[PDB]
Structure 1
Amino acid sequence: KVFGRCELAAAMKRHGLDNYRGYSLGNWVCAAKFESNFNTQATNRNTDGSTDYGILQINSRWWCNDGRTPGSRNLCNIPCSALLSSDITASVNCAKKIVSDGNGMNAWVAWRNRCKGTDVQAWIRGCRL
């Protein structure tokens, strides 16, 4: 599923991501924009053989099981395919663990490089929230 901007903002809010660990909703929408272009089915291979999945490009190296990332962990206790669903529950619940790992949203390199320090509230402008 390819979400609209405000559609994704609303879904993220319903799943409790707004201000989760102090990160306003615009931060999460911005991260999703640059990680996946709001596409739940996005995947991308990493240099180490791991794969990133879903709207927030969650890596199989640590967070989900895809059966082909030898030596990895599955800390969100989910198949990576769950991160591709039209229902964002799995991606959100796993993102909540990730952002709690210590480095906050710096875990998403695209957030650090493209959202951090910018006017991220623009990403929820106009949305009914």
Structure 2
Amino acid sequence: KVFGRCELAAAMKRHGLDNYRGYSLGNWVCAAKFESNFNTQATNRNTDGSTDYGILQINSRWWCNDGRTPGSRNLCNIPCSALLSSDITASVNCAKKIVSDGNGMNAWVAWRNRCKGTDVQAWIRGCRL
């Protein structure tokens, strides 16, 4: 599923991601934009053999199991395929764990390089929230 901007903002809010760990909804929408272009089916291979999955490109190195990342963890206790669903519940719940692990949203390189310190409210501007 490719979400619209305000559609994704609403779904993220419904799943309690807005202001989670002090990160406003605009931060999460901006992260999703540059990680996946709002596409739940996005996948990308990393150089080390791990793969990033879903709307927030969660890494199989640590967070999910995809059966082909030797030595990796599965801290969200989920198949990586669950992170590709049209329903974003699994991605949101796993993202809540990731953003809580000490480094906040810096865990998402695209957020740090393209959202952090920017006018992130722009990403929810005009949305009926």
Q: CA deviation at 1:78?
A: 0.2
Distance 1:63 1:69 in 2: 11
Question: Aligned residue for 1:84?
Answer: 84
Q: CA deviation at 1:12?
A: 0.1
Q: State the aligned residue count.
A: 129
Runs of 4+, deviation exceeding 2 Å = none
1:45-91 deviation per Cα after TM superposition (whole angstroms, max 9, x unaligned): 00100000000000000000000000000000000000000000000
Q: CA deviation at 1:114?
A: 0.1
The reply to whether residue 36 of structure 1 matches residue 31 of structure 2 is no
Q: CA deviation at 1:98?
A: 0.1
The unaligned stretches of length 5 or more in structure 2 are none
Q: CA deviation at 1:123?
A: 0.1
Distance 2:15 2:108 in 1: 19
SS of match in other structure, 1:121: helix
Distance 1:126 1:79 in 2: 35
Q: CA deviation at 1:17?
A: 0.2
Distance 1:108 1:84 in 2: 17
Distance 1:7 1:37 in 2: 13
1:28-57 deviation per Cα after TM superposition (whole angstroms, max 9, x unaligned): 000000000000000000010000000000
SS of match in other structure, 1:10: helix
Q: Percent identity over the alignment?
A: 100
SS of match in other structure, 1:40: coil
SS of match in other structure, 2:118: coil
Question: Aligned residue for 1:8?
Answer: 8
Distance 1:48 1:73 in 2: 14
Alpha carbon RMSD of aligned pairs, Å? Answer: 0.2
User: What TM-score comes out, normalization by structure 1 length?
Assistant: 1.00
Distance 1:65 1:85 in 2: 15
Q: CA deviation at 1:120?
A: 0.1
Question: Aligned residue for 1:23?
Answer: 23
